[PDB]
Amino acid sequence: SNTIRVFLPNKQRTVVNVRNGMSLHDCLMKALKVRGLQPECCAVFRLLHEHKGKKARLDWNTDAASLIGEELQVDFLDHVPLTTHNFARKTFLKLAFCDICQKFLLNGFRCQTCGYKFHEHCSTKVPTMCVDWS
Amino acid sequence: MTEYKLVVVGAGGVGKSALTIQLIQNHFVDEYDPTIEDSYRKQVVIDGETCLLDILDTAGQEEAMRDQYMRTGEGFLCVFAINNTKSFEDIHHYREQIKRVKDSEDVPMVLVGNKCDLPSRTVDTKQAQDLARSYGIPFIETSAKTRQGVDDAFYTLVREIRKHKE
Ligand SMILES: Nc1nc2c(ncn2[C@@H]2O[C@H](COP(=O)(O)OP(=O)(O)NP(=O)(O)O)[C@@H](O)[C@H]2O)c(=O)[nH]1
Ligand SMILES: [Cl-]
Ligand SMILES: [Cl-]
Ligand SMILES: [Cl-]
Ligand SMILES: [Mg+2]
Ligand SMILES: [Zn+2]
Ligand SMILES: [Zn+2]
């Protein structure tokens, strides 16, 4: 079929079905935003399979149909303030509130990088990417 | 951190993607975008332990490509829609495929009945409970629209993988 296998940041992947006329950006917007990723923080590459390099950067507005049959990869731009969380168990002796549900938080979990504090039953609502501008 | 490789299987349109995206992004996708191949990674805290869920969202329309991801998978969410008896019976075919690639009757699985928000129910809870009882696996009622039981479905499958590892 007229599909493209695109490897995504953080060891993820998707297979998009190219509609005639769509750009790489049009085909990959939903796959990135559903995974909590911003297209402005990413670049799209063509995986090279010869001795020259490992991949070559492509313009986001490139016609996707012209790359049918090639393997692509989307990576974070250089040094974007996006990383993965570092969760840790944490008992709040002093009164605290959950960042997800705003209720009382006695025994919760806190990310040691961004400070996101939450109940265990609220962890799935924590955003996938950890924003670190420290 | 322990990584759990999860695979979501089921007939086309039962809500495999809507359940996964509701877990990852906390948003309900109300459009029909038939999946070809989609993998997701997300940290979740389950019973005090943080773990990384590597979820493979598969195609209900089957675009032999299943066997490869069925061999490497650690747990499976066999999903059907409570308003689609055909998908409820299709569950048997998916468990047959998984057992054919795992070479064991003891595979971590969780039967998931989705679309519980709809009043046009054709598969009642007793039926799915009996089917899950027949397979020796848990059963979870979910609704990706209301997020009901979405966490409960994935939390249960992880616990099935933990006890399967002894
Ligand atoms: N009311 C309701 N609609 C749902 C629910 N889950 C999914 N849907 C609807 O079901 C349709 C198909 O959902 P989708 O997640 O794409 O299903 P799928 O099982 O992944 N399909 P496919 O196999 O093709 O990839 C969409 O219109 C979606 O909004 C639910 O719990 N309640
Ligand atoms: Cl890079
Ligand atoms: Cl919601
Ligand atoms: Cl992550
Ligand atoms: Mg789908
Ligand atoms: Zn964080
Ligand atoms: Zn909370």
Side-chain angles (χ1 to χ4, degrees), chain A residues 1-105 107-134, chain B:
Chain A
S1 292
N2 46 335
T3 60
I4 301 180
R5 198 159 187 255
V6 184
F7 297 104
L8 298 179
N10 288 129
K11 301 180 180 180
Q12 300 175 109
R13 66 187 190 275
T14 187
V15 175
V16 300
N17 206 329
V18 175
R19 292 182 183 174
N20 192 31
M22 298 204 106
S23 71
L24 297 181
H25 194 273
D26 296 326
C27 299
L28 294 163
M29 265 199 72
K30 179 174 180 176
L32 293 174
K33 303 188 73 174
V34 161
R35 291 171 178 83
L37 307 175
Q38 300 203 47
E40 293 87 350
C41 313
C42 299
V44 55
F45 300 81
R46 170 215 283 260
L47 290 185
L48 308 171
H49 307 281
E50 292 177 350
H51 207 356
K52 293 179 179 179
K54 232 154 80 172
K55 63 189 186 186
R57 192 164 172 172
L58 303 172
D59 175 55
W60 268 115
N61 303 339
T62 297
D63 197 310
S66 70
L67 290 155
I68 295 176
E70 293 277 305
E71 282 189 333
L72 302 184
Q73 177 167 320
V74 176
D75 281 291
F76 288 127
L77 296 170
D78 295 327
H79 198 238
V80 292
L82 300 183
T83 189
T84 52
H85 301 291
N86 177 232
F87 290 153
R89 205 174 300 102
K90 165 85 175 150
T91 295
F92 295 83
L93 303 161
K94 183 190 183 69
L95 202 57
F97 299 87
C98 172
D99 293 341
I100 296 293
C101 72
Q102 290 75 58
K103 295 192 176 186
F104 292 144
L105 183 59
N107 291 310
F109 298 88
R110 189 167 63 183
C111 192
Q112 309 198 245
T113 305
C114 66
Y116 236 107
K117 43 181 167 65
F118 51 94
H119 299 94
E120 165 168 331
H121 68 77
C122 299
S123 58
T124 62
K125 299 193 189 65
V126 181
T128 72
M129 297 313 295
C130 177
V131 184
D132 182 9
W133 197 262
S134 57
Chain B
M1 185 180 304
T2 303
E3 292 184 37
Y4 297 100
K5 301 199 170 307
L6 276 42
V7 182
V8 188
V9 300
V14 301
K16 296 181 299 299
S17 301
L19 289 169
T20 301
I21 297 173
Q22 183 66 260
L23 180 87
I24 304 298
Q25 193 60 18
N26 191 21
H27 189 266
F28 173 55
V29 180
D30 73 302
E31 77 255 12
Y32 197 164
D33 198 358
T35 308
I36 306 176
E37 181 173 320
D38 272 301
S39 71
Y40 303 85
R41 285 168 66 100
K42 170 107 171 184
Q43 300 183 24
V44 181
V45 176
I46 306 174
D47 299 326
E49 188 188 77
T50 306
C51 57
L52 196 280
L53 301 190
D54 199 322
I55 308 175
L56 182 76
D57 185 21
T58 71
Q61 307 165 354
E62 182 217 331
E63 271 222 26
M65 303 300 279
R66 304 190 188 268
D67 308 347
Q68 176 236 40
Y69 69 62
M70 286 188 177
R71 181 72 191 155
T72 43
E74 306 186 50
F76 299 88
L77 280 191
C78 302
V79 186
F80 69 95
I82 68 161
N83 67 326
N84 186 10
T85 300
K86 215 281 184 175
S87 69
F88 178 66
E89 296 178 348
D90 287 339
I91 288 291
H92 183 73
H93 175 244
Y94 285 99
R95 183 175 175 268
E96 289 297 87
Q97 279 197 86
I98 298 171
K99 281 163 54 261
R100 221 181 302 110
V101 197
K102 288 307 193 189
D103 290 283
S104 184
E105 283 250 347
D106 185 52
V107 180
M109 285 184 301
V110 169
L111 184 64
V112 174
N114 199 27
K115 303 186 179 183
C116 286
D117 55 291
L118 300 178
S120 54
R121 193 185 191 105
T122 70
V123 182
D124 51 62
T125 306
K126 293 179 179 179
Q127 283 182 289
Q129 280 185 347
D130 292 354
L131 182 65
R133 209 189 327 277
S134 164
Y135 293 157
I137 61 176
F139 167 64
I140 302 293
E141 282 190 1
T142 65
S143 167
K145 190 173 188 176
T146 75
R147 206 168 198 276
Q148 181 206 43
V150 170
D151 284 0
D152 198 6
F154 284 95
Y155 276 54
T156 299
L157 180 56
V158 173
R159 299 188 180 105
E160 285 287 88
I161 298 177
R162 286 175 173 173
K163 57 176 286 189
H164 174 65
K165 291 181 175 180
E166 301 174 351

